[PDB]
Amino acid sequence: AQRTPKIQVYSRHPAENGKSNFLNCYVSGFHPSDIEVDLLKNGERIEKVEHSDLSFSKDWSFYLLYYTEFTPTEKDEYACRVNHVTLSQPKIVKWDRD
Amino acid sequence: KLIETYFSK
Amino acid sequence: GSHSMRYFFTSVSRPGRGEPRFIAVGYVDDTQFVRFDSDAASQRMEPRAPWIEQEGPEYWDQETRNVKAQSQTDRVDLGTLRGYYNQSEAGSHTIQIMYGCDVGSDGRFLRGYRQDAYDGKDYIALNEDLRSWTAADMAAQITKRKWEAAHEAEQLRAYLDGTCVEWLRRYLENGKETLQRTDPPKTHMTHHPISDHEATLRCWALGFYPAEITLTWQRDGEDQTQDTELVETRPAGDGTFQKWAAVVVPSGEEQRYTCHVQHEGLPKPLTLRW
């Protein structure tokens, strides 16, 4: 029944400094649905953040897309904070262009 | 189109 | 290729913050077209695709009517199941329902679906004949007997192989340039040394539709399916999906490897040597 989320941080299009884009945090394969997800800019929580509608796979586990428009710069770092009942501690996955 | 008929469980 | 229409419903009880959170999503293939959320300000079945917006108000009124009826039975089902299982009102529980249908390239009925889950475990499901049910535990058997006695599958079958199928065809036509489109994967490979003796080869697929894709790593021809890491196919958020597969390889033997890519959007399967 209980399942740990799998977390992916990535951009919609290949990142290009100075060009607006979308930062995605995709969480899938988890259960139950109650889950906390934040997108971080240099550690600061981002407020204007959208998420998709709750849905599930053939095994009943859930998936969600959290996303926000952004403009990547060379120096700025982005990450995703996920908190879920299966994690002994909130997990922070850093956005890696590579 | 959603189904139009419903039955409790 | 074939098509499908899927509805997904989720109800989670909030003890004791109030009443269940209810969320409903409709899909046509890998494209969401409608949505309902009990917490949204709208309190209406909402469109999530351009082609569905064509439907008149009688359609929308009808759909929000039906989606609230759905939630009101899942709301009552939570109460009923808690009683079947002898559970306390303390804990929070989840009911999940999926139903839908597949049609072929000529729009002929293919398969009908309806499966229910409780707390992330199979509860009850309609078999492929669309005339009988399968219970997962002794609680679901109580439900099974009730539905059999009332012949509830008949009306359900009439929807799955009839109404569902005819409306799916309708959507596929109204949104033909969106739903009957195909977007091939844009592919490339990246190299990642781990140590002096090893490195990861990663095969990327980007911007493809629909979401079904097969990424295979090959060595001198053989398939390395046994030692490959795949991530779950992910939405780019613009209607297309992304995915990659990775092999850990002995350096320097990277040149013996090839990525094989299969996708409905590709005329011929891809073979990429590193």
Residue numbers in the entry:
A (entry chain B): 1 to 98
B (entry chain C): 1 to 9
C (entry chain A): 1 to 274
Task: Paste lines from the article.
The structure of the human major histocompatability (MHC) class I molecule HLA-A*0301 (HLA-A3) in complex with a nonameric peptide (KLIETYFSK) has been determined by X-­ray crystallography to 2.7 Å resolution. PLP45-53, a nonameric peptide, adopts a typical arched conformation within this groove with its N- and C-terminal residues bound in the A and F pockets, respectively. The B pocket is a primary peptide anchor-binding pocket in HLA-A3 alleles. The pocket has a predominantly hydrophobic character consistent with the reported preference for Val, Leu and Met at position 2 of the peptides which bind to HLA-A3. PLP P2 Leu tucks under Asn66 with its side chain directed towards the α1 helix and its main chain involved in a hydrogen bond to Glu63. As a result, both P4 Glu and P5 Thr are solvent-exposed and extend above the binding groove, positioning them as potential TCR contact residues. In contrast to residues P4–P6, the P7 Phe side chain is deeply buried within the groove inserting into the E pocket. P9 Lys is further stabilized by a triad of aspartic acid residues (residues 74, 77 and 116) which serve to anchor the positively charged peptide side chain within the pocket. Substitution of Tyr (the residue in HLA-A2) by Asp at position 116 in HLA-A3 opens the base of the F pocket, providing a sufficient volume to accommodate P9 Lys which would be sterically hindered in HLA-A2. Comparison of the structure of HLA-A3 with that of HLA-A2, an MHC class I molecule which is protective against MS, indicates that both MHC class I molecules present very similar faces for T-cell receptor recognition whilst differing in the specificity of their peptide-binding grooves.
Major histocompatability (MHC) class I molecules are heterodimeric glycoproteins that are present on the surface of almost all nucleated cells. Their primary role is to present peptides derived from endogenous cellular proteins for recognition by T-cell receptors (TCRs) on the surface of CD8+ cytotoxic T-lymphocytes (CTLs). HLA-A3 is a predisposing allele for multiple sclerosis (MS), an auto­immune disease of the central nervous system. The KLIETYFSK peptide is a naturally processed epitope of proteolipid protein, a myelin protein and candidate target for immune-mediated myelin destruction in MS.
